[PDB]
Every structure is written in structure tokens, then in C-alpha cells.
Design a protein around this ligand. Structure first.
Ligand SMILES: [N]C(=O)C1=[C][N+]([C]2O[C]([C]OP(=O)([O-])OP(=O)([O-])O[C][C]3O[C](N4[C]=NC5=C4N=[C][N+]=C5[N])[C]([O])[C]3[O])[C]([O])[C]2[O])=[C][C]=C1N1=[C]C(I)=[C][N]1
Ligand SMILES: [N]C(=O)C1=[C][N+]([C]2O[C]([C]OP(=O)([O-])OP(=O)([O-])O[C][C]3O[C](N4[C]=NC5=C4N=[C][N+]=C5[N])[C]([O])[C]3[O])[C]([O])[C]2[O])=[C][C]=C1N1=[C]C(I)=[C][N]1
Ligand code: ZN
Ligand code: ZN
Ligand code: ZN
Ligand code: ZN
Lengths: 374, 374
């Protein structure tokens, strides 16, 4: 009934920075060759979406944001082979083209077709499928999930189990997989190790899940909001510390607590200072620190390279280092097999029309993940 | 015969920064418990010794420098069990106490007993074995090899093959092992990979040796002194580039040359800017950059953490990541079995008495390693 036709539907359009989303009617073009049009079922509110609002993350405006989601294929363009109308799917904000040097490399996941490094806010072919009040609207990360319908390139979508609960597994599209993979795949946390996790939001809690799954003996949560500590302990933190409680820098505190530095630290906030602190608190000869948070655009940190010369390793990753199209269906299968839990991350479930209220909960510190339902 | 007695001998004392060494008589006390007094046979001139002169590497003055050396045990203190008088030995500027958390860790080598992090310029017991003009003189990195005799703690000396040629294997005490291990142990260079090596001195040439040994397909040497290129090619560089020849920054050149960034890069100079350039030139999703050079004291670099967030790994190491006391005798055994060559590193030989000429050769750019003979 809609295949081949322009769809008019509701989306949340961001017309300019530092404004509420506008919930209004948009036109969604049909998919061109190698494109997929998805009916959205559920989408999470990630801090990275708020970064677009705040100007922390720069991407062309006006835009349809949203990148953590799940939905059902409405139609496919010519030449699509990996999904069919009716399939449950998760959009992939890091694509997997399968052809580039990164996709071919055993470790890399930051596919060269990404729209992260040099954001264009379009489909692969450099155009947009969205119109609103007669004006073209940009895509975001090739996904644009804050809309009843989106169009994505085939390399930016994965088919998942037909029985999966979309209102939970949307989190595999960003927050859960990013944190969990940062621990198990990027850091490669070891059994019996001591971990420090800076930032106890949806992503940091998922890092904790991964550290516990990996067998860490101690997992120290760090957050300036002590209301975040109870849930961090539920999912595996052994101890939580608030930097504001101490008269000395928290890297010194964590170094003392761990009798000379932690084995693994994770920055899961997005601040230059905590990136350096998290590096410093890992053991100087063999510690590993992983940057997960997204910092403000175009700002450099300052650090003393002796922190590295003694033996520390510093790395970062997008999407937990997971090759996105290969990994997403397997993560959903693992969820269906009860290998990990997603409910601990979900604090609020709201209709899509309450998107602004959902962002206000995040900004105020009150929520972990709000899932919006279409 | 000299056991238990003070030895008067010649050493090269550095009384103040930015002045020639003074070759003059010092008094060397006998070894206390768990100390070893060594008659030096050969010592190399490493750029880190020059860093003491220049104030790049800060350690208490006046001082007897020198850390890349080999000699013969003259006497042992009470309780020493790992060397005997007459044994050939290499002093270990990074100790291996065998008891601390780092020594017990499978990967770590920066032993907590080191005198690098918070330099005191003493023996383990906080005192000095050197007197000159009636004044106490500091040790350097627990080794102080610019002296006809030195005293070192037992954890800072390794017994080596009785037949080894000390005028060659002194290089295993620093420059060869540092560079080679940075490639084979720290970076873990893989077969068929592309490597970039910044700085083609003694240590950078040893990194090239390691990259070639590990099977790299391309090894790009980078130096502003084109006179360094011929020897770099002899030990395995496939191409060399001088940043001075280009209008574009060399990270851009190297990214172009490697069709999108190198697999492994190494900073082997000691400049903040080239540390950042070397990180930038490795591939953004899966590249690894290793800092080997020693930066100017207390100075911070500035960098954009997005370089890490895409997936790069940044690390550093002292002494090529080798656990020193375990590794040095094995490296000497491998040299004796022709598993690697040291002669390409040695461009000049001088008597100890011409130490200042040896430093002039390093500073002029003419030498790689000058070996000084006692
Ligand atoms: N890498 C990748 O991929 C990624 C990234 N991301 C990031 O991360 C971060 C985080 O997120 P989330 O979790 O979502 O957030 P929230 O919830 O908001 O949480 C946070 C936390 O933190 C804390 N804090 C603050 N501040 C501070 C703290 N702590 C401590 N200290 C301080 N100072 C609070 O409280 C909370 O709790 C961010 O940054 C983001 O962005 C994510 C994800 C992923 N992505 C990327 C993308 I381009 C998209 N997505
Ligand atoms: N880590 C460890 O352990 C170490 C370190 N270290 C260091 O390193 C470096 C290097 O050294 P050497 O090799 O000896 O030096 P030389 O010979 O001088 O070489 C260098 C080079 O570079 C170059 N450049 C300059 N500038 C530049 C360049 N290139 C490029 N760019 C630029 N800009 C020149 O020309 C030459 O050739 C240093 O830093 C040192 O220090 C060593 C060893 C080891 N240690 C440590 C220690 I305490 C002691 N030892
Ligand atoms: Zn790709
Ligand atoms: Zn996200
Ligand atoms: Zn130790
Ligand atoms: Zn050295």
C-alpha cells in the first residue's frame, strides 16, 4: 500500500541547535537502489543525540536525529538482498560495507562509508529522502530513527530475529553494544582484574555488564551523580565513588584504592579532563584505558606523554569495536538466549510524541535509557 | 685483591647541564649487601645520556651518567646469588626485582624499583657509592656506566654468556633491545603490514630491524636528516621520506602513501609534535602507534581525542617492553647465534677518554652509536 510511494508521516525535526525537537509531518521518499525503508517500532534516547542539540556533536542541520532503534522493513529498493519487507531490523549507525580496508581487517569496525568523521547528513548517494515544509532535511549517521519511517542504505541495516522484542533490542543498536563491546572486545578485560568506569549512564552501565561478564574481580563506578550508584551496583559495580566527595584528584584516589592503578579504565562521559584522569588511574606499566565518550567538537586535550612511555595503552572505539552488520544479529540472538540483560538500562518508556520530555529526563540526570514507542 | 676496598678510578662526571663531561678520579665504594661492583669494558652513547646534559631528561646533578654498557664483575656484596666475580654482565637501567606487581604481570616491565619515574640518583638504599673531590656524586638509572667501575643493585644486573663480545653486546643494554622490542613485543608488528618509523638513530634503526624480523611488507623511515636514509634502507626500510621535502604535513603524506594510514607507527625521536603526527599517520580504525622517544621534561602535548575514538591504539614503552633481567641474557644468546646483527648500529669506536668527542659526533648528526672502550 505504500511501496513505491512517498510516505507522509510524523518525525521529530531539529531545525537548529539548542531548541526542542519539532514533532511534525515529513515526506519520506521511497528507497532507491540498495536502500531500505523502515517502519520504526522503538527508539532509545542516547546522549549522542543530545550532543546534536547541544552543539557538542556537529552535523548538518536541519536534521532528523536518532540512531538507536528497531523497526520493520516496509519496502526495499532494487538490488537489496539482505532484508525483505516484514523483517525486523536494527539500523546501523556505523555501517559495514564489507569491501573497504577496515571491513576486511580482522579488528577494525569503523567502516570507511561512515558519516561520522566528515558528516554530510545524507544517504550514501549524497542526497536526502526527507522533506519537511518543502525543505530538504538532513539524515543523521545514515539512520535518522526519530521518525515513523526512515530510509537507510543496505550497509546500514541488519536483519534480526523475527521473534525479538523491538522495545528492548533497540538498545543493541547503540548503548548496550557500545558499552559491552568496549569492555569485552576493545579493552579485552581479564578475569580477576580491577576496572574503573567513569560515567554510569546507559553506556557506562553496559561497560559494567561487560566487565562483570569478563570476570573482573573489582569494578569501581565513578560518577558525580550519586543517584546513579544503586543501579551500577545492581549490574556489577563492587564500589562507587563520587569525585566531589574527595579533597584530592580522583586519579589519586583510584590509584590508592587499587594499590597502584587499575588494570582497565573506561571514559564513558565525554569530557577532556576525565579522559586524562581515566588514563592516569590505570597502572602505569600495563594499564589499559579506553575512551568511549564523545567530546565537544574541535577541542584538544593536554597530557604528559610519560603516562604512555611507562607502558600504558590508550585507545578508543565507536560502537564497542563491533563490526556492525555481523555483530548486531548475533547480539540479538544472545539476548534471546538470556546471555545478557537489557531491562536494567531502561528506566522510562514513553510514546514517541513525548520525545522532548525524554530528553528532559536525560538532561536532568533522572533517566538511564528512555525508549520511545511509535 | 680490591674486594672490600674503595677503588679509585676514572669516571666521566657531569657537574652541570650543557657542559662537557669531566674525566677525573672518583672513589667507588665496595658493594653493600645485594650489590655488585663491575669493571666496565664498553659503553655506548645513547641519546638519553645526552638528554641529561641538555636538561631534557631531569635527574639530580652532579651525576655519573651512562646506561648502555657491559662489563665484568669485580666483587659481590653479601647475599648476591645471581652473579659472581669474573662473570660478564650488562647493567639493567630498568630493574627486574621479580617481586612487585609489575614484575609478576605477564606484560609489564617497568619495575616499581626503577629510578626513572621520580629520579633520586641513588642506589636502592637511597645512598651513593661515588665520591669526587670529596663530594658525593649521583648515580643515573641505577647504572652509571660512564666509569671504569660502577656499583649496581643486584636487581639491576644480568649475567650473560662468558664468550660474548662486550664491545658489541653493550647495545643490548639499551638501544637495540629498546627499538627491537618496541616493534616485536610492544607494537606486535604483523606479517605483511606497513610500518612508519620516525627517527633513524640507533633506536629507530633497531625498530626497523624488528619490523623486518616481524615480516612487515613496507617500512617507511622518516627523518629530517637524509644522511640517515642509506643505513635505514640497509637494515630494512623500503622507502625513506624527509618531512622537509613536502609542502603538506607528513601525517598527510604518510596516509596517502599507505592508501589510508599505516598499520604501525613509531615515534623514536622525543618531540611532542612528532608523537602526535605519528599517531595521526596510523590508520584511524585499527592503527597502532608506539611512543619510544623521551619527551622534554614536564611538557604536555596537545591532541584531539577523536584520533583515538575512531579506533587507534596509542602506547609507549621503556626498554622495548622487555622484562630486563629475564630478557637480556636471552637476547645475548640470540645475538651469539646470529639471530640479529649489532654492527649496523656501530658507526664509531673511541676510548672512554674521548667521551666528549663521542658526544660531539652524536650532536652533529654524524654517528649512530659510538662505543667507548675502557
Ligand atoms: N563510542 C561510541 O560509539 C559512543 C559514545 N557515546 C558517548 O558516551 C557518553 C555516555 O553516553 P550515555 O551513557 O548515553 O550518557 P549519559 O546517560 O548522559 O551518562 C553520562 C554519565 O556521566 C556522568 N558524568 C557527567 N559528568 C561527570 C560524570 N561522571 C563523572 N565525572 C564528571 N565530571 C553523568 O552523571 C552521567 O551519569 C556520551 O559522551 C556519548 O556521546 C555513546 C554511544 C556511542 N555513540 C557514538 C555516536 I557518533 C552515537 N552513539
Ligand atoms: N623508550 C626507551 O626506553 C628509550 C628511549 N630513548 C629515546 O629514543 C629517542 C631516540 O634515541 P636515539 O636513537 O639514541 O637518538 P638519535 O640517534 O638522536 O636519533 C634521533 C633521530 O631523530 C631525527 N629527528 C630529529 N628531529 C626530527 C627527526 N626525525 C624526524 N623529524 C624531526 N622533527 C634525527 O635526525 C635522528 O636521526 C631519544 O629521545 C631517546 O632519549 C632511547 C633509548 C631508551 N632509553 C630510555 C632511557 I630513561 C634511557 N634510554
Ligand atoms: Zn566498509
Ligand atoms: Zn549512541
Ligand atoms: Zn619489580
Ligand atoms: Zn638508552
Amino acid at each position: 500500500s505504500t511501496a513505491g510511494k512517498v510516505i507522509k508521516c510524523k518525525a521529530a525535526v531539529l531545525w537548529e541547535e539548542k531548541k526542542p525537537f519539532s514533532i511534525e509531518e515529513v515526506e519520506v521518499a521511497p528507497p532507491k537502489a540498495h536502500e531500505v525503508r523502515i517502519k520504526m517500532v522503538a527508539t532509545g534516547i542516547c546522549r549522542s543525540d543530545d550532543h546534536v542539540v547541544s552543539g557538542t556533536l556537529v552535523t548538518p542541520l536541519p536534521v532528523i536525529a536518532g540512531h538507536e532503534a528497531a523497526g520493520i522493513v516496509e519496502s526495499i529498493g532494487e538490488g537489496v538482498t539482505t532484508v525483505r519487507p516484514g523483517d525486523k531490523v536494527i539500523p546501523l549507525f556505523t555501517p559495514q560495507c564489507g569491501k573497504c580496508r577496515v571491513c576486511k581487517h580482522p579488528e577494525g569496525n569503523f567502516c570507511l562509508k561512515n558519516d561520522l568523521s566528515m558528516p554530510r547528513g545524507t544517504m550514501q548517494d549524497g542526497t536526502s529522502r526527507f522533506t519537511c515544509r518543502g525543505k530538504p532535511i538532513h539524515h543523521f549517521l545514515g539512520t535518522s530513527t526519530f521518525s515513523q519511517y526512515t530510509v537507510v542504505d543496505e550497509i546500514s541495516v541488519a536483519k534480526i530475529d523475527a521473534a525479538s522484542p523491538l522495545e528492548k533490542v533497540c538498545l543493541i543498536g547503540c548503548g548496550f553494544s557500545t558499552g559491552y563491546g568496549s569492555a569485552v572486545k576493545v579493552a579485552k578485560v581479564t578475569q580477576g582484574s580491577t576496572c574503573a568506569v567513569f560515567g554510569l549512564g546507559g553506556v557506562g552501565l553496559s561497560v559494567i555488564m561487560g566487565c562483570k561478564a569478563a570476570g573482573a574481580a573489582r569494578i569501581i563506578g565513578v560518577d558525580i551523580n550519586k543517584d546513579k550508584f544503586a543501579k551500577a551496583k545492581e549490574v556489577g559495580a563492587t564500589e562507587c565513588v563520587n569525585p566531589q566527595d574527595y579533597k584530592k584528584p580522583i586519579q589519586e584516589v583510584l590509584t590508592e584504592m587499587s594499590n597502584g592503578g587499575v588494570d582497565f579504565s573506561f571514559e564513558v562521559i565525554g569530557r577532556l579532563d576525565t579522559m586524562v584522569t581515566a588514563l592516569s588511574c590505570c597502572q602505569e606499566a600495563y594499564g589499559v584505558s579506553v575512551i568511549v565518550g564523545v567530546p565537544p567538537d574541535s577541542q584538544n586535550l593536554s597530557m604528559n606523554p610519560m603516562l604512555l612511555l611507562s607502558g600504558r595503552t590508550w585507545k578508543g572505539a565507536i560502537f564497542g569495536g563491533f563490526k556492525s552488520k555481523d555483530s548486531v544479529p548475533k547480539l540479538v540472538a544472545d539476548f534471546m538466549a538470556k546471555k545478557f540483560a537489557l531491562d536494567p538500562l531502561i528506566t522510562h518508556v514513553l510514546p514517541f510524541e513525548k520525545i522532548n520530555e525524554g530528553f528532559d529526563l536525560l538532561r536532568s540526570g533522572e533517566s538511564i535509557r528512555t525508549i520511545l514507542t511509535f
